[PDB]
Amino acid sequence: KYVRGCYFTNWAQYRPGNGKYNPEHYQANLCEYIFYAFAKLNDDFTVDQFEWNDIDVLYPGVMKQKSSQPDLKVLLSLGGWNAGTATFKKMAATYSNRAKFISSLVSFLQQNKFDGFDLDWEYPESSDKENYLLLCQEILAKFEEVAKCTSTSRLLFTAAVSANPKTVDAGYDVPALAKVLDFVNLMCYDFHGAWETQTGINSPLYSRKEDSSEFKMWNVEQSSKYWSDKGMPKKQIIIGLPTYGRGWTLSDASKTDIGAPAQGSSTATEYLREAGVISYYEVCQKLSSGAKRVWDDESKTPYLVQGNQWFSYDDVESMKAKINWIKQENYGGAFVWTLDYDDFLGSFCTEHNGKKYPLISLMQEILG
């Protein structure tokens, strides 16, 4: 009745100390689907592994989890934000280029025992709309062809899609893609971040009265609605849950409101070491240090203040509110980004008595 998904990342193995995330850190029945991020798209449009140890170690490591969760399905994700669109745009522009990518892809999936493919082209533009459609149609066709041919279940085929309606209009033929994609993973996050000069919410459930006109649809609720109205069935919209936060350095540590002015990004944190970004477990460390929390009931998310540092993030209350809203509105489910941001050891946080995956466990718990 409800999809429950989780992104694994193949660079989380390089965090320092207990931030290091390995496939053995996964938990049985946490996720129905594990989206592996990412494969590499070569310049010649062929698919290969991205990290030097995927084929030999990490891919099989994730697959071993099926031993204790037999209907765990694992899909290979290609793209992401770092990858950009340059290869994608070229690869998709001709039938023969997509044929080379598709065929290369089908073979890389079979060899490495994946259950499906997840296209995270971030993002198709006007010039790519029609190409994108054909690319997906042809991926389903080959998958359909391969399945009848080899007498197997068809490979699964999903896309991570843009939550910004202006992009959805530009680059997605939504009714056509509905007929073709299994489901879409709605990236209803990153709505606000340190690229802005004032504090905002990362992933607000609802809009806020103080939002300006350009952002009245930049919430989970209204962005999922937009996909619904463009012709994607609600059951094929899967709601993105962010286990990370974004943060600013406050311009004045006395104005600490949603919208307070900021002079730059939050200082890079101990583990993710990316300025402007905090993992959930890092938040728990900060709480333990007398960082103060503030619920925002309008948007149903918390923020965190400590010194001149201000983070929007997501915790058990905000996650409880979104997943419940997933059920109340009958969207297709939830997915989490990422596994390695939660308190996967269950030792960085203390409010949860040591429960592993305080945040991600909510999916199986509430969505069954």
Residue numbers in the entry: 32 to 399
Publication passage describing the model:
Here, we focus on the identification and characterization of proteins selectively secreted by the first larval stages of T. suis. We screened a set of n = 6 recombinant larval proteins for immunomodulatory properties and identified an enzymatically active T. suis chitinase that interfered with recruitment of immune cells and inflammatory reactions in a murine model of allergic airway disease. While our in vitro data suggest no direct immunomodulatory effects on, e.g., DC function or T cell activation, we observed disease amelioration to be associated with suppression of eosinophil recruitment into the lung and increased numbers of alternatively activated RELMα+ lung macrophages. Since mammalian host chitinases, both true chitinases with enzymatic activity (AMCase and chitotriosidase) and chitinase-like protein (CLP) molecules which can bind to chitin but lack enzymatic activity, are implicated as either mediators or biomarkers involved in airway inflammation and fibrosis, disease amelioration by treating with a worm chitinase was rather surprising.
